[PDB]
Amino acid sequence: MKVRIATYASHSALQILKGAKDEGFETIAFGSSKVKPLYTKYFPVADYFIEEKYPEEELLNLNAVVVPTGSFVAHLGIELVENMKVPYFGNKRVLRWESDRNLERKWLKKAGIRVPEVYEDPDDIEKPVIVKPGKGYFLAKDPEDFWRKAEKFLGIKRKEDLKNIQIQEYVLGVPVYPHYFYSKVREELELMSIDRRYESNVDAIGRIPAKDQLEFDMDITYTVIGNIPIVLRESLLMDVIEAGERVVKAAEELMGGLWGPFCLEGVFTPDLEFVVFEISARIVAGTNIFVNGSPYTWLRYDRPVSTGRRIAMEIREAIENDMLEKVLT
Amino acid sequence: MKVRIATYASHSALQILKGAKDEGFETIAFGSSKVKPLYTKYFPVADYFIEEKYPEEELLNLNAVVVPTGSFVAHLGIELVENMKVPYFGNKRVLRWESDRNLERKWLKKAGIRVPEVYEDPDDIEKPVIVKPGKGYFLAKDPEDFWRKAEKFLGIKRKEDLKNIQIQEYVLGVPVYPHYFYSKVREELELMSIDRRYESNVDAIGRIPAKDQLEFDMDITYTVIGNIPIVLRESLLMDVIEAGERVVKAAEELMGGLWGPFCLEGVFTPDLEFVVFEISARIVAGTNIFVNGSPYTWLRYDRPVSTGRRIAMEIREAIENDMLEKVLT
Amino acid sequence: MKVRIATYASHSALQILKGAKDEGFETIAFGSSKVKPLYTKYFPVADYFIEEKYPEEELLNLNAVVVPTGSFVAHLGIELVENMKVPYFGNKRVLRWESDRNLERKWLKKAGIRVPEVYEDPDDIEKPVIVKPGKGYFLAKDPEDFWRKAEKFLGIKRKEDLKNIQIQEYVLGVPVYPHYFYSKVREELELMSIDRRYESNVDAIGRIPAKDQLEFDMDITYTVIGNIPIVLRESLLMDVIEAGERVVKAAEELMGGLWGPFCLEGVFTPDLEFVVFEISARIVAGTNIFVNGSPYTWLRYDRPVSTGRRIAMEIREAIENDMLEKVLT
Ligand SMILES: Nc1ncnc2c1ncn2[C@@H]1O[C@H](COP(=O)(O)O)[C@@H](O)[C@H]1O
Ligand SMILES: Nc1ncnc2c1ncn2[C@@H]1O[C@H](COP(=O)(O)O)[C@@H](O)[C@H]1O
Ligand SMILES: Nc1ncnc2c1ncn2[C@@H]1O[C@H](COP(=O)(O)O)[C@@H](O)[C@H]1O
Ligand SMILES: NC(=O)c1ncn([C@@H]2O[C@H](COP(=O)(O)O)[C@@H](O)[C@H]2O)c1N
Ligand SMILES: NC(=O)c1ncn([C@@H]2O[C@H](COP(=O)(O)O)[C@@H](O)[C@H]2O)c1N
Ligand SMILES: NC(=O)c1ncn([C@@H]2O[C@H](COP(=O)(O)O)[C@@H](O)[C@H]2O)c1N
Numbered sequence: 001m002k003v004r005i006a007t008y009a010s011h012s013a014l015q016i017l018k019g020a021k022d023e024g025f026e027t028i029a030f031g032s033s034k035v036k037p038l039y040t041k042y043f044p045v046a047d048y049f050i051e052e053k054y055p056e057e058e059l060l061n062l063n064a065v066v067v068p069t070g071s072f073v074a075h076l077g078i079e080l081v082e083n084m085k086v087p088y089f090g091n092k093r094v095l096r097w098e099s100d101r102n103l104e105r106k107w108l109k110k111a112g113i114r115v116p117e118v119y120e121d122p123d124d125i126e127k128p129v130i131v132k133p134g135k136g137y138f139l140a141k142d143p144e145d146f147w148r149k150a151e152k153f154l155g156i157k158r159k160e161d162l163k164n165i166q167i168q169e170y171v172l173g174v175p176v177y178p179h180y181f182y183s184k185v186r187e188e189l190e191l192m193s194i195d196r197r198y199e200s201n202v203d204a205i206g207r208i209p210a211k212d213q214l215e216f217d218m219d220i221t222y223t224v225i226g227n228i229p230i231v232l233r234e235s236l237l238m239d240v241i242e243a244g245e246r247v248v249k250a251a252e253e254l255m256g257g258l259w260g261p262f263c264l265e266g267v268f269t270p271d272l273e274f275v276v277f278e279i280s281a282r283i284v285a286g287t288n289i290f291v292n293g294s295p296y297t298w299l300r301y302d303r304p305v306s307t308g309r310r311i312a313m314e315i316r317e318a319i320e321n322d323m324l325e326k327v328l329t
Numbered sequence: 330m331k332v333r334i335a336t337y338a339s340h341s342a343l344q345i346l347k348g349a350k351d352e353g354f355e356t357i358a359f360g361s362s363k364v365k366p367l368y369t370k371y372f373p374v375a376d377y378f379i380e381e382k383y384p385e386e387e388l389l390n391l392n393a394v395v396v397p398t399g400s401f402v403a404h405l406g407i408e409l410v411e412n413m414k415v416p417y418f419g420n421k422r423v424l425r426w427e428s429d430r431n432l433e434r435k436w437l438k439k440a441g442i443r444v445p446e447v448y449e450d451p452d453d454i455e456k457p458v459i460v461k462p463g464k465g466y467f468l469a470k471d472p473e474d475f476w477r478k479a480e481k482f483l484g485i486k487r488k489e490d491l492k493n494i495q496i497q498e499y500v501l502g503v504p505v506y507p508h509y510f511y512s513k514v515r516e517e518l519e520l521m522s523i524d525r526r527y528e529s530n531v532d533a534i535g536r537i538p539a540k541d542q543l544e545f546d547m548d549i550t551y552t553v554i555g556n557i558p559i560v561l562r563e564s565l566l567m568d569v570i571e572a573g574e575r576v577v578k579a580a581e582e583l584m585g586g587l588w589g590p591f592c593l594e595g596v597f598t599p600d601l602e603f604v605v606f607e608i609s610a611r612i613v614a615g616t617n618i619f620v621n622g623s624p625y626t627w628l629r630y631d632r633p634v635s636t637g638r639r640i641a642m643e644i645r646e647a648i649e650n651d652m653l654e655k656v657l658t
Numbered sequence: 659m660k661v662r663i664a665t666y667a668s669h670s671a672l673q674i675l676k677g678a679k680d681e682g683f684e685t686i687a688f689g690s691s692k693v694k695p696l697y698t699k700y701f702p703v704a705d706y707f708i709e710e711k712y713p714e715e716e717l718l719n720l721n722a723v724v725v726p727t728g729s730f731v732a733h734l735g736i737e738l739v740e741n742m743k744v745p746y747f748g749n750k751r752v753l754r755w756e757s758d759r760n761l762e763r764k765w766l767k768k769a770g771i772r773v774p775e776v777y778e779d780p781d782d783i784e785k786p787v788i789v790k791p792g793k794g795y796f797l798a799k800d801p802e803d804f805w806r807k808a809e810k811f812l813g814i815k816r817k818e819d820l821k822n823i824q825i826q827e828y829v830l831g832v833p834v835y836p837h838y839f840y841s842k843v844r845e846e847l848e849l850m851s852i853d854r855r856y857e858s859n860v861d862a863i864g865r866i867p868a869k870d871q872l873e874f875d876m877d878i879t880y881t882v883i884g885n886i887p888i889v890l891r892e893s894l895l896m897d898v899i900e901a902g903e904r905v906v907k908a909a910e911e912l913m914g915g916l917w918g919p920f921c922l923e924g925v926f927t928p929d930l931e932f933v934v935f936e937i938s939a940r941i942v943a944g945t946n947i948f949v950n951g952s953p954y955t956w957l958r959y960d961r962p963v964s965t966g967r968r969i970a971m972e973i974r975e976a977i978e979n980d981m982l983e984k985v986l987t
C-alpha cells in the first residue's frame with residue numbers, strides 16, 4: 001500500500017497499528033518520546049515513530065491517513081484537528097457534535113435515544129435527580145430536598161442566587177459500552193464488541209463496608225483505569241443495534257454523516273432500558289480487549305477482527321474499490 | 330447433513346446457530362419478526378428464519394432438531410415443550426425437575442450438592458437467614474429479630490398469621506456460574522467455561538457511597554443484563570467438576586438422565602464452599618462469551634469450541650455413529 | 659525433548675502443562691490423588707501423574723525441570739524448595755526475597771516502586787492509615803483517632819501497651835495485577851497479560867445495601883476464588899512496564915537475578931498511580947485466563963501465547979542455544 005496508517009501514541013494506538021499491520025499497511029505512531037519503546041520494542045507495531053505532538057509535514061511526506069482516538073480532543077484540541085492537512089479517517093465535523101453538550105443532546109434526541117431528562121428549574125423536580133455543581137455531585141428527591149441541600153452544600157439561601165448547575169434525572173443502572181462500526185464502503189452497521197469500563201475510585205468503594213465508609217467524607221472519582229470484557233443478554237442486542245442505526249442516520253442529516261467506529265456510553269436499568277449518557281464518535285479504548293476478536297466478531301468472521309483491524313479493512317477496501325476519498329475528511 | 334439445527338430466536342441462538350454452521354449443519358431460527366435482522370443481517374447465522382413462536386409443521390418439514398434454551402420455559406411454557414413433536418436435543422423430562430422448587434431440591438439433595446438450609450419454622454433459626462415474602466427480601470439474625478421484622482415489614486402481629494414466606498440460610502459469597510456439558514455419545518462430562526452474570530440494579534449499588542444509599546429506601550433488583558468471563562482458582566475445579574458428575578448420576582436415577590449443557594448457579598464462600606442456589610438444565614447465556622472457545626476448552630481442543638459448537642459436535646457424532654435417537658427426546 | 663516439564667498439581671498446572679505440550683515437551687504433574695482426573699481425564703495435559711507431594715527421585719529419573727507456582731511456598735515450604743535436587747525454572751533465591759516482608763520492602767524500594775508508607779509510631783500519622791492487628795483491620799484518620807480505636811478494638815489503655823501491629827498508609831484504588839515475563843535467553847521483558855483477582859467475601863459486599871450491612875458486624879475476607887480479564891488504559895502501560903524493568907534490574911544486584919514470570923500486585927488510584935502491595939516472583943494464577951493468549955500477546959505474536967507456553971518457549975530456546983543451565987537453579 002502507498003497509504004500508511006498513522007495515529008497519536010496513546011489511547012488505542014497499539015490495537016490500531018497492529019490492525020493496520022494485519023491488513024498490509026505500513027504504520028506510524030507519533031507522540032511523546034517516553035512512550036516510543038511501547039510501540040517499537042515491547043509491542044513492535046509502529047514502523048515509524050515520530051517524536052512530535054503533530055508532525056503534519058512528515059505525515060504528508062509519508063502518505064499517512066490519521067485514525068482519530070480519544071487522545072485527539074484531549075491532547076491536540078478540536079481546532080488543531082479541524083485544521084489538519086493530513087487525511088483523517090472519519091468525518092471531522094462530528095468532533096463538535098460529540099463534544100458540545102447541547103449539540104450532543106440535539107443529536108441524541110434526533111436519533112430517538114433514551115437520555116436522562118434535564119431540569120432547568122429545580123421546582124420542576126418530580127423524580128430523584130443528580131445535581132452537578134464528577135465532584136460535588138449529590139442526589140435530590142424533590143424541590144424541598146434540593147433547596148435544603150443547595151443551602152447545605154452550596155450556600156444558596158435565596159432562589160435567585162442559584163447559578164451554573166446541572167440538574168438531571170438520576171438513572172440507576174449497570175454501565176454498558178457497546179462498540180459499533182459503520183462501514184461507508186459497504187453501507188452497513190456492525191456491533192464489534194462490548195465492554196464495562198473500570199474506574200477509580202468508584203469501582204473500589206464497593207469493597208469498603210458501609211460502616212468504614214461513613215466515618216469519612218467520601219470523594220467519589222471516575223478516573224478511567226481500564227476495561228473489562230462483557231456480552232449482553234441476547235434479547236437486548238436488537239435495540240442496542242437499532243440505536244446505533246438511528247445515530248448514524250441522524251448524523252447523515254445533521255453533520256454530513258458518521259462512519260467508522262463509535263460508542264454509546266450508558267447504563268442498563270432493571271427495566272431493561274439502555275439509557276445513554278454520552279456518545280463517543282470514534283474508536284473507544286474498550287475495544288483494546290478485542291485484539292484477537294470478540295464474542296461478536298467471531299459470530300461473523302473466520303479470523304480475529306478488532307476495531308483497529310476493522311478500520312484498516314475499511315481503508316484497504318476503499319482503496320480496492322477506488323473510493324478512498326469517500327472515507328476521509 | 331439431513332438434520333437441521335433449530336432454536337428460538339433469543340437467549341443464545343447466535344452462539345448455537347454459529348456452532349451448528351461450524352459443524353456443517355443448516356440452521357433455523359424461529360421467533361419475533363423484530364429480531365430477524367439480528368440473525369440474518371447483523372450476524373448471518375440463520376439459513377432460515379420463521380416468524381412464528383413455534384412453527385411445528387415447518388420445523389418437521391425442514392427435518393429440524395430443536396436445541397432448548399432459557400427462552401423455552403420463559404416464552405413457550407413447559408406444557409408446550411413437553412408436547413412438541415419436533416425432536417428435542419436433551420431430555421425434556423428435566424424441565425419439571427429444574428423448574429419445580431421441590432423437585433429441584435430433591436435432585437440437588439440426591440446429588441449431594443451443598444445448598445442453603447431451608448427453615449420451615451422461624452423459631453428454629455440459629456444462624457442468619459434471608460426471608461423471601463427478589464423484592465421485599467430481608468435478613469434476620471434469630472427468631473426474635475425475625476418476629477420484630479415480620480411485624481415491621483409484613484404486619485404480622487400473631488405467629489398464626491404468618492403465611493406463604495420462604496426462610497433460607499443466608500449464604501454470603503461471590504456469584505460463580507460453571508458451565509458443563511455431558512456427552513451421552515462419549516459418556517463423558519466436560520467443563521466448558523465459567524462466567525459471572527451481570528445484574529441490575531444489584532451490580533450498580535456498589536458504586537453508590539453508603540451515605541447516599543441511606544437517604545433512600547433501596548429497591549434491589551436482579552435483572553440479568555449480561556455476562557463477564559472468569560476462571561476459577563485451579564484447586565477449586567475438582568470439586569466443581571465432581572458436583573457436575575453427581576448431578577448427572579442423580580438424574581440417571583430420577584428422570585431418565587441428563588445430557589448436553591447445564592449449569593449450577595451459586596456462590597463461593599470465603600471458606601471455599603460452592604453453595605448452589607439453582608440448576609439450569611440446558612445451555613445458559615453465560616456461554617455466549619465463549620464463541621471463540623474458553624480458557625477451559627483451549628486446554629483440551631485445537632480449535633474454538635463454544636457450548637453451541639459442542640452441541641452441534643454431539644449431534645454430528647451421534648449421526649456418525651448411528652445413535653441420534655439416543656440424544657433426542 | 660529429553661527434558662520434561664513438571665509442576666505441582668495445583669495453582670496453574672493446567673496452563674503450564676498445556677503450554678509445555680504445545681512446545682513439544684512431555685509433561686509431569688505431581689500432587690494429590692484426588693486431583694489426578696483433572697490433569698489426565700477432564701483436561702489431559704499430564705503425560706505422567708505422580709501421586710506424591712514431591713517425588714524427587716522419580717522426577718530426576720524422568721529428567722524433569724520443575725516450574726514453580728504459588729502452591730510451592732504454600733504447600734511444600736521454602737526450605738524444601740531451596741534444597742530440591744530437581745532443576746528449578748527461575749532463581750530459587752527469589753523465594754525469600756518475595757516472602758520476607760522486610761526483604762520484599764527492600765527490593766521494592768531499590769526498584770523505585772511506589773508502595774504504602776509504613777508508620778512505626780502512631781503519633782506520626784498525618785494521613786489516613788490502615789491498622790493491621792485481613793482480619794481486625796480498621797482505618798484511622800490521625801493519632802487521636804488511632805488511640806481511641808486502639809482502646810475500643812484492642813483494649814490498649816496505655817501507649818507502652820501497644821504491641822505487634824502494622825500501621826500503613828491507606829491507599830484507595832482499584833485492584834490491578836500486571837503479569838510480566840523476563841526472558842533470560844533474550845534479555846527482554848514482556849507484558850503477558852493483566853487480570854483483576856476475584857475475592858470472597860470482599861467482592862460480594864458491594865451487592866449488599868448499606869442499610870442491610872449496618873445491622874451486622876461485617877467480617878471482611880479476601881479469599882481468592884478466581885480471576886477476571888482486564889486491559890489497562892494504554893497511556894498507563896509504559897510506567898507499568900518500566901516498573902517491571904526496575905524490579906528485574908534490582909534483583910540482578912540483590913539476589914542473583916529475576917527471570918521468568920512475575921507479577922506486581924497493587925491498585926490504581928484516581929490520580930493514575932500504580933501502588934504496589936506485593937510482588938509475586940513466579941507465575942500467578944491470573945495468567946490462567948490466557949490459555950489462548952491475551953489482548954497483549956496477540957499484539958506481538960501470530961499464535962496463542964499463555965504465560966505457561968512462554969515458559970516452555972524459554973526452556974526450548976535455552977536448549978536450542980545450549981544455555982539451559984542459565985535459566986535453571
Ligand atoms: N443522570 C445520571 N444518572 C446516574 N448517574 C450518572 C448521571 N450522570 C452521570 N452519572 C455518573 O457519574 C459519572 C460522572 O458524571 P459526568 O461528570 O457527567 O461524566 C458518570 O460516569 C456516571 O457514572
Ligand atoms: N440463601 C441465599 N443467600 C444469599 N443470597 C441469596 C439467597 N437466595 C437468593 N439470594 C440472592 O438473591 C437473588 C434473588 O433470589 P431469588 O429470587 O431466590 O432468585 C439471587 O440471585 C441471589 O443473588
Ligand atoms: N495499605 C493498604 N491500603 C489499602 N488497602 C490495603 C492496604 N493493605 C492491604 N489492603 C487490602 O487488604 C487486603 C488484605 O491485606 P493483607 O492482609 O495485607 O494482604 C489486601 O488484599 C488489600 O486489598
Ligand atoms: N445470563 C444471561 O445473559 C441470561 N439471558 C437470559 N437468561 C434467562 O433466560 C430467560 C429468558 O431470556 P430472554 O427474556 O432474554 O429471552 C431470562 O428470564 C433469564 O432467566 C439469562 N440468565
Ligand atoms: N489468583 C488465583 O486464582 C490464585 N490461586 C492461587 N493463588 C495463591 O496461591 C496459593 C496456593 O493456591 P492453592 O491453595 O489453590 O493451591 C494461594 O494461597 C494464593 O495465595 C492465587 N492468588
Ligand atoms: N476506557 C479507556 O481505557 C480510556 N482510555 C482513554 N479514555 C479517554 O480518552 C482520553 C485520553 O486518554 P489518555 O489520557 O490515556 O491519552 C481520556 O481522558 C478518556 O476520556 C478512555 N475512556
Ligand SMILES: [Cl-]
Binds near residue numbers: 070280285
Ligand atoms: Cl474512550
Ligand SMILES: [Cl-]
Binds near residue numbers: 399612613614615
Ligand atoms: Cl441462562
Ligand SMILES: [Cl-]
Binds near residue numbers: 938943
Ligand atoms: Cl497467584
Ligand code: NA
Binds near residue numbers: 099104278
Ligand atoms: Na461525547
Ligand code: NA
Binds near residue numbers: 427607
Ligand atoms: Na432451576
Ligand code: NA
Binds near residue numbers: 756936937
Ligand atoms: Na510477595
